[PDB]
Amino acid sequence: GAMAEEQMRLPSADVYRFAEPDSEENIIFEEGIPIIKAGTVIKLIERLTYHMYADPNFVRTFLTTYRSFCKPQELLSLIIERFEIPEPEPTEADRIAPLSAELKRFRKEYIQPVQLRVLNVCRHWVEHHFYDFERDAYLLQRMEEFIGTVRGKAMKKWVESITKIIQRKKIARTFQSSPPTVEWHISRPGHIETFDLLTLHPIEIARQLTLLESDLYRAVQPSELVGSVWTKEDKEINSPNLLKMIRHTTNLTLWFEKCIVETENLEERVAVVSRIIEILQVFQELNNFNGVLEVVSAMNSSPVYRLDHTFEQIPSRQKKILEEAHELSEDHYKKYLAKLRSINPPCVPFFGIYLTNILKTEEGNPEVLKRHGKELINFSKRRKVAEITGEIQQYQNQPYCLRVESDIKRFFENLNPMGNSMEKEFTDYLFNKSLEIEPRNPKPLPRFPKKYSYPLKSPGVRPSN
């Protein structure tokens, strides 16, 4: 009948694997274009390059998330296999001569569509995920060999499009208004040896940290966050921008804490804490939420939070600024999310919430769905992770109208509060320091000598003008 003639126009299973019929043990749909919930890798590949229509949302999401279920080498082999569609046997009259009625139909309404879909996938792959090819030379060699063997009229427009992108990527390996004057306090321009928390201008500390954190945020690719690859063995290769962002947050947070608890003299320590709150204030003015929450993290850390004698001397206005910042996180980040959505560019989003929500998604949904004793890759799980990475991306084109100061930038890039200590070791030391500088009751509060020989008064956070 009509379904048999439809199916038998497609190639048989013993000569092509991507044309078995859809069923409940190779593909499930979640509910226009149908949105795939789960399927076998062969079925995903089929739909990724489906003949009947374009599916830009599925291509995008697949190429973002596929490494969580299929290696790049495997994916390339599977799309090349998908591309090499066999033609059916001829009829008796054609064999003798050729009319080729059904064969010419098959080329037009199946082979050519599917092949154009494969090239589209190849183009999206090299354009948006070239890193796969940077990390694997043989993969690139295979792609270029494949693309250079593609023949036909329709193809050359694609083959030239793809080849130009590849060459572009091999070769690939400002201010709209006046930025404000760079601010200085005690440390003079160029006197890098005296650069420190209290000697640089707090306005400029916040500005330069904001530029640095903006660039780090903007560099994170979505695939660095898929399948929790940043917590796995090849993290340094798969998640290098992500790791740089996380490492910066750790180092800055711990450096704030170190600055505080290593200032043993009470009065000086109050000046340190106060200065850090002023930096938070400028982060808030810049909508660098990432920076705001780094300060909140340090202030709420075990070593710092317990310093009641220090916080007692912090003016009420600064306590209130710090409290409002901590409030951002309360009730599953309700105030933070509302604020993030209400502002205009530029901003730096709080990065940690993405990591937290991605990990909850990874840990809370199964890798596969089981139907009829068969395992289907859970694609909705990948799509949810991709949607969270999509939120990240929507804030990645927001440059600040701030001038870089190269020496201050370098100072923050090179922070290493931990030295040669492991983190746990260092945070235990911070807490023991906290105990030394403000002992638990009923132990008396000792006095400690001053360590700073320059004035402690802040220049404030109002810029010159």
Residue-wise DSSP of 191-217: -GGG--TTTS-HHHHHHHHHHHHHHHH
Structure tokens at 4: 């048999």
Q: Are 346 and 399 in contact (CB under 8 A)?
A: yes
Reported as half-sphere exposure (CB side, CA atoms, 13 A), residue 212 has a value of 26
Cβ atoms within 10 Å of 237's Cβ, excluding its own? 10
Q: SS3 for 376?
A: strand
What residues are paired with 29 via a beta bridge? 36
Determine contact, residues 384/361, Cβ cutoff 8 Å: yes
Experimentally, the structure was elucidated by X-ray
Q: If you search the block for the tokens 């990240």, which residue do you land on?
A: 392
Task: Kindly give, in sequence order, each residue whose CB lies less than 8 Å from that of residue 172, ignoring residues fewer than 6 positions away.
Answer: none
Distances 238 to 68, 131, 232, 458 between C-alpha atoms, Å? 11, 9, 9, 43
**What is the tally of helices (H) and strands (E) in the chain?**
23, 4
Euclidean distance between CA atoms 459 and 203, whole angstroms: 9
* Those residues with Cβ within 8 angstroms of residue 332's Cβ, 6 or more apart along the chain or in another chain: none
Q: Residues with Cβ < 8 Å from 410, sequence gap 6 or more?
A: 192
Resolution (A): 1.9
* Separation between Cα atoms, residue 62 and residue 450, nearest integer Å: 59
Question: What's the Rg (C-alpha) of the chain?
Answer: 29
- The CATH architecture assigned to 9-170+352-394 reads Up-down Bundle (1.20)
All residues at 6 or more sequence positions from 50 whose CB lies less than 8 Å from its CB, including other chains: 114, 117
Residue 368's identity, in one-letter code, is: V
3-state helix, strand, coil in the chain (%, to 5): 60, 5, 35
Superfamily of domain 180-351+395-464: Ras guanine-nucleotide exchange factors catalytic domain (1.10.840.10)
- Give me the sign of the Cα torsion angle 228, 229, 231, 236: negative
Strand partners, 38: 28, 378
Name the phi and psi angles at 377, rounded to 5. -65, 130
Residues 108 and 249: their CA atoms lie apart, in Å, by 55
Return the closest-CA partner of residue 431 out of 295, 304, 312, 265. Answer: 304
What number of CA atoms fall less than 13 Å from residue 86's CA on the CB side? 13
Closest of 435, 422, 196 to residue 304, by C-alpha: 435
Question: What gap in Å lies between CA 196 and CA 271, rounded to an integer?
Answer: 13
Report the length, in residues, of the chain.
Answer: 465
Q: Please report, for the chain, the start and end positions of each structural domain, with discontinuous segments joined by +.
A: 9-170+352-394, 180-351+395-464
Q: Do domains 9-170+352-394 and 180-351+395-464 have the same CATH topology?
A: no
Q: Which residues contact 41 (CB under 8 A, 6 or more apart)?
A: 69, 70, 74, 78, 377
Phi, psi torsion values for 35, nearest 5 degrees: -105, 120
Decide if 253 contacts 291 (C-beta within 8 A). no
